[PDB]
């Protein structure tokens, strides 16, 4: 028995060892209570405004759309404290942890932005934070490791499997299964077992709510489409949620195409995987014929995960949202374009969303369209990676 629906159509659920069910039920109950609690809401709002810096800007980028009929805005989550949208929901989950009387946080991270958000929130609110991170990601997202450690978090490299985000997720969940009495698992995306996909959406939905208000102010109408990258699903569902009932507004999610879908080296399960059960949920997965979970690949550590949140699988299935893929090379071109023509250095994750918007414009340059791209984070963490690639060229 749960208070809220654990499923989105076929997708979702609570596929965890029995030991963890009380913890998930306790978290669900605390969330439902908090959502009705004006004092909780006021605390959360205060942190978002005065600590994190919400609301974030909506920037019109009128060099990159020159000569076309596309108008493009960027929702500037890169300006949030910590440098990505991850900060929004970590502040809410940290308050839930305190509400439940927990003193310790476990988190996984890939890009290191969720890790940094977890560390900063733990420093502010007086929690002991330990963060699992794949060893390959420790190397390719090294600036974030330094930031986490300076803020007092323990960062634990994971050498198992692909040594990337999936492997960090595995270790975090194994830890929680033994530590849940004292530790809250601060899952960093809209995936995993119920109630996480629901909590993460509700604590990210200010992205879309602000976007709506801002675009109505500037343009007097809703966007033709909103576009967001999809690693596990949080920044995309945060952008989409407030528009789901606005049927004219396209919702486009961008999965990592890696070296190309045809190579098998990608992270695009929604469109190229098969429903399975893993990481506490029934969702599209990259899996072998026999049902082993495959290793994903992306140039972007934050998108490098072989599954996706169940609400995106649902929105796809009913045709309310469309999902596409962008390759490493496409993402790199969009990264370079934004740096040189708008003076914004985007996260490589966010560069996937931008690359698809640029393709929408370039493919049909006389199509009138008003687009919003969620610029989910800044690219400081990626500058060494990108430099080394452009140099090798």
């Amino acid at each position: 028995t749960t208070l809220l629906n654990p499923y989105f159509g076929e997708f979702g659920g609570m596929y965890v060892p029995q030991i963890l069910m009380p913890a998930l039920n306790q978290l669900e109950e605390a969330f439902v209570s908090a959502q009705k609690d004006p004092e909780f809401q006021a605390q959360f709002a205060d942190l978002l405004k005065n600590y994190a810096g919400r609301p974030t800007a909506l920037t019109k980028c009128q060099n990159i759309t020159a000569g076309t009929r596309t108008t493009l805005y960027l929702k500037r989550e890169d300006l949030l404290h910590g440098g990505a949208h991850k900060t929004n929901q970590v502040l809410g989950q940290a308050l839930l942890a305190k509400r439940m009387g927990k003193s310790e946080i476990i988190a996984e991270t890939g890009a290191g932005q969720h890790g940094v958000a977890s560390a900063l929130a733990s420093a502010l609110l007086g929690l002991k934070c330990r963060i699992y991170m794949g060893a390959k990601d420790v190397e390719r997202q090294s600036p974030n490791v330094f930031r986490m450690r300076l803020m007092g978090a323990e960062v634990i490299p994971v050498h198992s499997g692909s040594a990337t985000l999936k492997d960090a997720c595995n270790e975090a969940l194994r830890d929680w299964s033994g530590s849940y009495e004292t530790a809250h698992y601060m899952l960093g995306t809209a995936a995993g077992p119920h109630p996480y996909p629901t909590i993460v959406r509700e604590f990210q939905r200010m992205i879309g709510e602000e976007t709506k208000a801002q675009i109505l102010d500037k343009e007097g109408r809703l966007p033709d489409a909103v576009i967001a990258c999809v690693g596990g699903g949080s920044n995309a569902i945060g952008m989409f949620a407030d528009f789901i009932n606005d049927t004219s507004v396209g919702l486009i999610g961008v999965e990592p195409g890696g070296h190309g879908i045809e190579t098998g080296e990608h992270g695009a399960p929604l469109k190229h995987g098969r429903v399975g059960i893993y990481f506490g949920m029934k969702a599209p997965m990259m899996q072998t014929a026999d049902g082993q979970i495959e290793e994903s690949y992306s140039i972007s550590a934050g998108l490098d995960f072989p599954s996706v949140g169940p609400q995106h699988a649902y929105l796809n299935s009913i045709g309310r949202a469309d999902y596409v893929s962008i390759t490493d090379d496409e993402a790199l071109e969009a990264f370079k374009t934004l740096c040189r023509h708008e003076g914004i250095i985007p996260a490589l994750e966010s560069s996937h969303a931008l690359a698809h918007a640029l393709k929408m414009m370039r493919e049909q340059p006389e199509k009138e369209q008003l687009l919003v791209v969620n610029l989910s984070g800044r690219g400081d963490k990626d500058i060494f990676t990108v430099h080394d690639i452009l140099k090798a060229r």
Partner: protein, 267 residues
């Protein structure tokens, strides 16, 4: 019915069960088969057998590493079913349980999975990442194919959960010794007497205690506390890991250990 017969026999002789776990195909198919023959000859009452899975989230490093060894030998679920046929052909009466992760059961069809289990002569399936709340299609398919679905009774089980586990499960009830993941070094606790007695009250399948059971003393303590027996995995797997380079010494050490663990179940 292999479990029913086993527990009746053990009851008549006033003994507990000792049930080893190993990963199928670790460290290879042929050696795995010989390992399992040794466990049985040394006095195992039943077997728990793991099908290698890419991401075993209820398992600590020892059994993670067993999975990796099996994959390095190229073991697939299909080969596991080949192995199970060979084991059942040699050993007609011993209860055989599988430890499964959900995706391997759900992959290309729940019903088809339990049908393959029945065809090969498996007796029970424990799906580690399916709680009772998600269990309906699994337990229904299991019962349709005369397979016992195994459920977990955790240390902090409430009354509602005890009632569900007693109603839905068959074969044996898995009495979890502690929170956390599998591992020999993390010992855990004595069978909560209150859980043992409540499961009996509700006519649950007999309880086997597992997680962190690594010594004869702990086996004796489980039976004294009223459990029908005990499961040991990591302790067994550690003997495999330690002796990879000497398969003869591996079997001798497994025999000695299993013999002692079984003796402790007679206490």
């Amino acid at each position: 019915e292999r479990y029913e017969n086993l527990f009746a026999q053990l009851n008549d002789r006033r003994e507990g069960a000792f049930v080893p776990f190993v990963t199928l195909g670790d460290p290879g198919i042929e050696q795995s088969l010989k390992i399992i023959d040794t466990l049985i000859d040394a006095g195992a009452d039943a077997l728990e057998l793991g099908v290698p899975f890419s991401d075993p989230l209820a398992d600590g490093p020892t059994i993670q590493n067993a999975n990796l060894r099996a994959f390095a030998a190229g073991v697939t679920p299909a080969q596991c079913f080949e192995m199970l046929a060979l084991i059942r052909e040699k050993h007609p009466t011993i209860p055989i349980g599988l430890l499964m992760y959900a995706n391997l059961v759900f992959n290309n069809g729940i019903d088809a999975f339990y049908a393959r289990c029945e065809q090969v002569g498996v007796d029970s399936v424990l799906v580690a990442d399916v709680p009772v709340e998600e269990s309906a299609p699994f337990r229904q398919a299991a019962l349709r194919h005369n397979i016992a679905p195994i459920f977990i009774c955790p240390p902090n089980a409430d009354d509602d959960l005890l009632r569900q586990v007693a109603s839905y499960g068959r074969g044996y009830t898995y009495l979890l010794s502690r929170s956390g993941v599998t591992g020999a070094e993390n010992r855990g606790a004595l069978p909560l007497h209150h859980l043992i007695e409540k499961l009996k009250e509700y006519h649950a399948a007999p309880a086997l205690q597992g997680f962190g059971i690594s010594s004869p003393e702990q086996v004796s303590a489980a039976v004294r506390a009223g459990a029908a027996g005990a499961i040991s995995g990591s302790a067994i797997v550690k003997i495999i890991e330690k002796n990879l380079a000497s398969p003869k010494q591996m079997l001798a050490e497994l025999r000695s250990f299993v013999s002692a663990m079984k003796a402790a179940s007679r206490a």
